[PDB]
């Protein structure tokens, strides 16, 4: 269920039919790994199997020593917040001496439990790997002795497997200063991660969404290194919370619109600047100017309200009436009539100016359409490629019906003698007043010229 | 064979002599892995070596289950296209019924083979790993039984080796949602990639170009996960193919050019904005405003037409005549007379204004030159460092001849009383008309005051 509409007069296209999945909040979870505070190896025996356990044990001791040091278009209008501020407040609560202990207590019998912290919040904590029990119960009594022996090399392999997960986790943290994104399968396996989503205090629809799209959740999640004390290592995992789901979303593609005079220096241009994602939200509209920060899986849209603006529903009028009196549609002007192209969701927009060659072709029959000078559109049905001069683009092959909304390019209504071609962050009214300011300028000068003597 | 010219009057420098390797299009390639439809381990033996096979085997079973879940300055003028649209459309064709089966057949006996798809296009395919054959023929009959035995432990290690490649490929996709770039050695070894490049439908020159710089091809490639069914795993690899090669490329460095009055805020500035990469292309010029999207290997230049503009050949006049009548050269204006520096390929440009200390030094003899206020230049021959106050830069030590082309700085020709110092995306004619338009009104207005 995907649609798309192109407005010939505004050189822009709107794709409708998408569904929402906006990150509203955060849940913090504590991940623990039971470590064994091991120091002097007493044994100095000579044996190949022994050597492997020793040098593997030094990798463990070195890894903990590393982590011990670790403990101590219109985007310019968006806000600035600390995304990992939630994890920070949590990991700081872990620095409390009693807080670490309450964790070990809660996870004595089972591997997963909810813990109420000293601040008074309930967070889900879980132990994922137990090296303390393996090392101290199977290795420390051997190594503490003068002459030690290892029978069967499989003992060495079993140790490397259990210890390997720690080194890759340590490796990830040592190059990212304790803040990793996305969250790796080393950091949290899917079997572990789904146990969180299933046990998270969220609604069933939220559960079903996260579970079918875990790889997206990973990218919008942070793994915060917290502390490592007593005989446990802990790090906090910051997970996104989607408070808004399934509201109708739509994407805005824009492209420059210019005149087509033969003399190059005489042309004037205008381009709609509000391209990006729009999603309904409580009668308002959350807007995302940088579509790169949003991920799409199937027909669902995952964005972050962090880089959003809350707009009135009337912003939708800019596509269906750019000269409406209720919302001033933002635009910019220039005299740079250069050929470029924009790929839409079900097709492509083409801005063809000057003598640049602009064509679209089929994989089987070759060129099917050659564009005129100006801004045109074509649907993905039966079209596969698009060429603007030497630049070549491919088009998305997502199915859906597209509709061409014909209309005279709006730039034809502006007198270039008074056109403010130097406005970069403007809008409809901002342009008209700049013209009205320039129109009054010559007019009074004419009136003063008219009433002399 | 690299050169460089500095223009004293426009406060900019051009580096010439490079060669082109611009990606005009894409080639899609299909990678297959024969997997084994495995069910629950029947054996529950109490052997340490067997236990290792069990837990290693579960890494395989979960990895497949993981992927089984997976299938459910002036840059603002550039175009906007979906680069991976080509690979995406292909992976969708794989979802078509019957397409998967004809693949498994075509490369049953051999590995690399050409397959014609349902739509009618020929794509290059290759088999990279057979776990189905090893697991089902050597392990599955054992595990299917109650009591199972593992004798030589070397058997376990060989399984760890074969299975490790699968686990790392699965991990890469789970953190990139099936779209990874560059293409890792896990995704495709160099031996495998050259078998593709040699068998690719490209020109001999393209073959030699890609082969001597494969690591760049990796960076301009995408690995798209496609499908996984019928005891087969497949994912498409999008490869850049360079339709334009060896045309003369040149890189433009720009820096601000200002006046040199003592009084602060009384200075006016002008900066050339069209910095980036330029390459000849079919009598036109492909321009890349974001030089970061371009990679340089030796004297070769690798860019993407996706982030290019196709400009006429006359655009080049901006370096040797910014006041030509055929191309309006883009610039920006400000009253921001701040000191800064730009490192070129064969030297460095220095913008020194106000009371700022600006010097360049040699690694052996220390300070060699002290700059005057304004826009100056120095070549890298015998010079290694550049200092702007306390800020320090190093210079590229690639050899080549640099030329200082003297000429009076163009900013000196502008009347500061009428200079539009508040324009950010302008050009010569756009400012010249703005000056001429703003200059004319006071002239008539003043005469009115006389009588």
């Amino acid at each position: 269920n995907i649609t798309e509409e192109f407005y010939q007069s505004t050189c822009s296209a709107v794709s409708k039919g998408y569904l929402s999945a906006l990150r509203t909040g955060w849940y913090t979870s504590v991940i623990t790994i039971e470590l064994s505070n091991i120091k002097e190896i007493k044994c100095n025996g000579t044996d190949a199997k022994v050597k492997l356990i020793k040098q593997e044990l030094d990798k463990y001791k070195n890894a903990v020593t590393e982590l011990q040091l670790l403990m101590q278009f219109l985007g310019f209008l968006l806000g600035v917040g600390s995304a990992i501020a939630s994890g920070v407040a949590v990991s700081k609560v872990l620095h409390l001496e009693g807080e670490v202990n309450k964790i070990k207590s809660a996870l004595l019998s089972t591997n997963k439990a909810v813990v109420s912290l000293s601040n008074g919040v309930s967070v889900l904590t879980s132990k994922v790997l137990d090296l303390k029990n393996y090392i101290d119960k199977q290795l420390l009594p051997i190594v503490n002795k003068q002459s030690c022996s290892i029978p069967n090399i499989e003992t060495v392999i079993e140790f490397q497997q259990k210890n390997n997960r720690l080194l890759e986790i340590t490796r990830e943290f040592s190059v990212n200063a304790g803040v990793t994104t996305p969250v790796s399968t080393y950091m949290l396996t899917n079997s572990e991660l789904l146990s969180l989503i299933n046990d998270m205090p969220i609604t069933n629809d939220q559960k079903k969404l996260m579970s079918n799209n875990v790889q997206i959740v990973r990218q919008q999640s942070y793994s915060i290194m917290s502390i490592i004390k007593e005989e446990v290592l802990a790090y906090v995992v910051q997970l996104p919370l989607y408070g808004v789901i399934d509201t109708p979303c739509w994407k805005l593609h824009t492209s420059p619109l210019c005149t087509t005079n033969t003399k190059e220096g005489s042309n004037i241009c205008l381009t709609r600047t509000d391209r990006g994602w729009y999603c309904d939200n409580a009668g308002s509209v959350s807007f995302f100017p940088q579509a790169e920060t949003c991920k799409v899986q199937s027909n669902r849209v995952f964005c972050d309200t962090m880089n959003s603006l809350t707009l009135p529903s009337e912003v939708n009028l800019c596509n269906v009436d750019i000269f409406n009196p209720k919302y001033d549609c933002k635009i910019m002007t220039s005299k740079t009539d250069v050929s470029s192209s924009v790929i839409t969701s079900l097709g492509a927009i083409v801005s063809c100016y000057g003598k640049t060659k602009c064509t679209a072709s089929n994989k089987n029959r070759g060129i099917i359409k050659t564009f005129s000078n100006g801004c045109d559109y074509v649907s993905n049905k039966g079209v596969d490629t698009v060429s603007v001069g030497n630049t070549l683009y491919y088009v998305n092959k997502q199915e859906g019906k597209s509709l061409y909304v014909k209309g005279e390019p709006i730039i034809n209504f502006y007198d270039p003698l008074v056109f403010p071609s130097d406005e970069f962050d403007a809008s409809i009214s901002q342009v008209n007043e700049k013209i009205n300011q320039s129109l009054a300028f010559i007019r009074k000068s004419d009136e003063l010229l008219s009433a002399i003597g | 064979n690299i050169t460089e010219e500095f223009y004293q009057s426009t406060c900019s420098a051009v580096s010439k002599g490079y060669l082109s390797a611009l990606r005009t299009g894409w080639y899609t390639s299909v990678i297959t892995i024969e997997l084994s439809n495995i069910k629950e381990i029947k054996c529950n033996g109490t052997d340490a070596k067997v236990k290792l096979i069990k837990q290693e085997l579960d890494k395989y079973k979960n990895a497949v289950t993981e992927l089984q879940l997976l299938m459910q300055f002036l840059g603002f003028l550039l175009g906007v296209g979906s680069a991976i649209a080509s690979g995406v459309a292909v992976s969708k064709v794989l979802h078509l019924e019957g397409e998967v089966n004809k693949i498994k057949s075509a490369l049953l006996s051999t590995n690399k083979a050409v397959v014609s798809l349902s739509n009618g296009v020929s794509v290059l395919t290759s088999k990279v790993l057979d776990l189905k054959n090893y697991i089902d023929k050597q392990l599955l009959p054992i595990v299917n039984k109650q009591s199972c035995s593992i004798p030589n432990i070397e058997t376990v290690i060989e399984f760890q080796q074969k299975n490790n490649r699968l686990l790392e490929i699965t991990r890469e996709f789970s953190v990139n949602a099936g779209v990874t770039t560059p293409v890792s050695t896990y995704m495709l070894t160099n031996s495998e990639l050259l078998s593709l490049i040699n068998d690719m439908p490209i020109t001999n020159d393209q073959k030699k170009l890609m082969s001597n710089n494969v690591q760049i091809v990796r960076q301009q490639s995408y690995s798209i996960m496609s499908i996984i069914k019928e005891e087969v795993l497949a994912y498409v690899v999008q490869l850049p193919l360079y339709g334009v090669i060896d045309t003369p490329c040149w890189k433009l460095h720009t820096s601000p050019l200002c006046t040199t009055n003592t009084k602060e805020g009384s200075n006016i500035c002008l900066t050339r904005t069209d910095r980036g990469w330029y390459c000849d292309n079919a009598g036109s010029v492909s321009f890349f405003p974001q030089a970061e999207t371009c990679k340089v290997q030796s004297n070769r230049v690798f860019c993407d037409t996706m982030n290019s503009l196709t400009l006429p050949s006359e655009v080049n006049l901006c370096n040797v005549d910014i006041f030509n009548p055929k191309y309006d050269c883009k610039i920006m204006t400000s009253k921001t007379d701040v000191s800064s520096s730009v490192i070129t390929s064969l030297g460095a440009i220095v913008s020194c204004y106000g009371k700022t200390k600006c010097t360049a030094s040699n690694k052996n003899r220390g300070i060699i030159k002290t700059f005057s206020n304004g826009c100056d230049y120095v070549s890298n021959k015998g010079v290694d460092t550049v200092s702007v106050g306390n800020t320090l830069y190093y210079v590229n030590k690639q050899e080549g001849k640099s030329l200082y082309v003297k000429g009076e700085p163009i900013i000196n020709f502008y009347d500061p009383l009428v200079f539009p110092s508040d324009e950010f995306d302008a050009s010569i004619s756009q400012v010249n008309e703005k000056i001429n338009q703003s200059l004319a009104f006071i002239r008539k207005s003043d005469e009115l005051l006389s009588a």
Partner: antibody, heavy 122, light 112 residues
Framework: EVQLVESGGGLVKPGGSLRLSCAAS????????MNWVRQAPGKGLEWVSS????????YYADSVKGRFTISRDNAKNSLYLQMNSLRAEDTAVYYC???????????????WGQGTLVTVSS | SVLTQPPSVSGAPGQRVTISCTGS?????????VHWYQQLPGTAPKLLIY???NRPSGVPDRFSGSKSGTSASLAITGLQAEDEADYYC????????????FGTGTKVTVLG
């Protein structure tokens, strides 16, 4: 508009040498790849040698490797083909041809010169 | 190997004629594109159709080309006498250090 002018061809004995010259004009020469294609009387067309736009890549047809030497001068708009140990079987009309641009390799020759005749016989 | 064309093709003015260009697995079957060149007798061969199916500027739309599998075809609909000439299809083969391949040639004889 686009022009190509061959020269230098004529009669020479087997084993002799000849340098063919092709002068182009009307466009930006140093941007395109150039090629030589020949044709014996009553026979088909045969590609001889290729040269990149900046001389960086050169290949010869397996029939003539080691005997023919291609060169270009991007400043003179010139293309040269040195031919040594010429044989009577090489007797053909030699055409100067430009390699056009395509989206993805395997390009076409968009413009051709008028050709020069090289006749070798004892 | 080399591309295969029938040497003699005859037709009356206004007839429809097709040219078969049979390749092999080492050229077309590898995916390379096909181009066609028109050679008036004694003249320089000029480009007729490029990119399998595209006519350049100043080529009558009467000419049309197709590519499928390992074969190629050129359609001349409504033949006229100014087309009595030699026609060659051209592609690229990957064997033996690579080399541009040409067809065996088609002399179209307009029965006037």
């Amino acid at each position: 508009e686009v022009q190509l002018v061959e020269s230098g061809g004529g009669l020479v004995k087997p084993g002799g040498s000849l340098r063919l010259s092709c002068a182009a004009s009307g466009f930006t020469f140093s941007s395109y790849s150039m090629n030589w294609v020949r044709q014996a009387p009553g026979k088909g067309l045969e590609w001889v040698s290729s040269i990149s736009s900046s001389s960086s890549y050169i290949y010869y047809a397996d029939s003539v490797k080691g005997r023919f030497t291609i060169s270009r001068d991007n400043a003179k708009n010139s293309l040269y083909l040195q031919m040594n140990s010429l044989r009577a079987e090489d007797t053909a009309v030699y055409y100067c041809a430009r390699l056009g641009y395509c989206s993805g390799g395997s390009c076409h020759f968009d413009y051709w010169g008028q050709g020069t005749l090289v006749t070798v016989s004892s | 190997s080399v591309l295969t064309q029938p040497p003699s093709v005859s037709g009356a003015p206004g007839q429809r004629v097709t040219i078969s260009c049979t390749g092999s697995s080492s050229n077309i079957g590898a995916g390379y594109d096909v181009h066609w060149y028109q050679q008036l007798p004694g003249t320089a061969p000029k480009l007729l159709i490029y990119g399998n199916s595209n006519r350049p500027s100043g080529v009558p739309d009467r000419f049309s080309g197709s590519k499928s599998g390992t074969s190629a075809s050129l359609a001349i609909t409504g033949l006229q006498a100014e087309d009595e000439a030699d026609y060659y299809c051209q592609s690229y083969d990957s064997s033996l250090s690579g080399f541009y391949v040409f067809g065996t040639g088609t002399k179209v004889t307009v029965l006037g």
